[PDB]
Design a protein around this ligand. Structure first.
Ligand SMILES: OC[C@H]1O[C@@H](O[C@H]2[C@H](O)[C@@H](O)[C@@H](O)O[C@@H]2CO)[C@H](O)[C@@H](O)[C@H]1O
Ligand SMILES: OC[C@H]1O[C@@H](O[C@H]2[C@H](O)[C@@H](O)[C@@H](O)O[C@@H]2CO)[C@H](O)[C@@H](O)[C@H]1O
Lengths: 133, 134
């Protein structure tokens, strides 16, 4: 099942998104999106997109239809058939991505944190839990 | 067991997430997490976070000039003798947010300025697996 949930007020510096799940043994890719509205293709403050098929993790944002400059984490801290824990942490400057007891990548903001209205987590992924503190 | 005392790598700013995983010993009385503003003993503390199994409570408070402030108390004791626990302390620009296990537990509004906190301490009757500052 894909996870979609609303953040009607916004994310402030201090919001923490915790995701726990499994990467299916035949996964291609999955994604974590933080969006500015209820429509698919709405602006994306963060697109967190680990591709097991091509062995990269990709970070970017979307404004008015078009992707920004892509950012790529180092190595791939996911593996097929194996469970994971991701923390996405919001600062005043960017997003911290923590995967498996270690920081992984920092993503300078491109969109005001305040314009975020939605968390969606879909793709080739089994979710045990998705929660925002 | 062993205690954790750690200097901070970027102080404590809005977005800092301390995660503590461990277990409460079967003969535990009380343990604590401190966000201290100084290295010496009795120093001011922005956050004192003290699960007490002996008096069935969790206290939250700040210390300034040796003088404890207004104590706050969590809902219940989400801590068990002989059992693992996972605690997150998240610094927002409003307060600190204690998350125990899977749910938010309490929110302590800042009292001391976030600028003063330069040390993390975790000790007492707590067996520690991992202490990470993110
Ligand atoms: O930036 C994230 C989106 O990028 C798209 O893929 C990019 C690809 O990563 C890049 O290296 C280059 O080859 O062009 C592609 C566009 O054709 C994905 O297609 C998209 O879903 C997002 O992941
Ligand atoms: O404020 C936290 C500190 O409380 C001290 O104990 C308090 C106690 O919590 C309160 O119920 C009342 O009885 O006054 C006591 C002071 O004797 C602790 O001694 C200190 O370690 C903190 O946990």
């Amino acid at each position: 099942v894909p996870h979609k949930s609303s953040l009607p007020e916004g994310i402030r510096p201090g919001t923490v998104l915790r995701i726990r799940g499994l990467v299916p043994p035949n996964a291609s890719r999955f994604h974590v999106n933080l969006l500015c509205g209820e429509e698919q293709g709405s602006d994306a403050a963060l697109h967190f997109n680990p591709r097991l098929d091509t062995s990269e993790v990709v970070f970017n944002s979307k404004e008015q239809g078009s992707w920004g400059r892509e950012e790529r984490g180092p190595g791939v801290p996911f593996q097929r058939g194996q469970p994971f824990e991701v923390l996405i942490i919001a600062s005043d400057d960017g997003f911290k991505a923590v995967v498996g007891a270690a920081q992984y990548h920092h993503f300078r903001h491109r969109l005001p944190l305040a314009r975020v209205r939605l968390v969606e987590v879909g793709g080739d992924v089994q979710l045990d839990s998705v929660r925002i503190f």
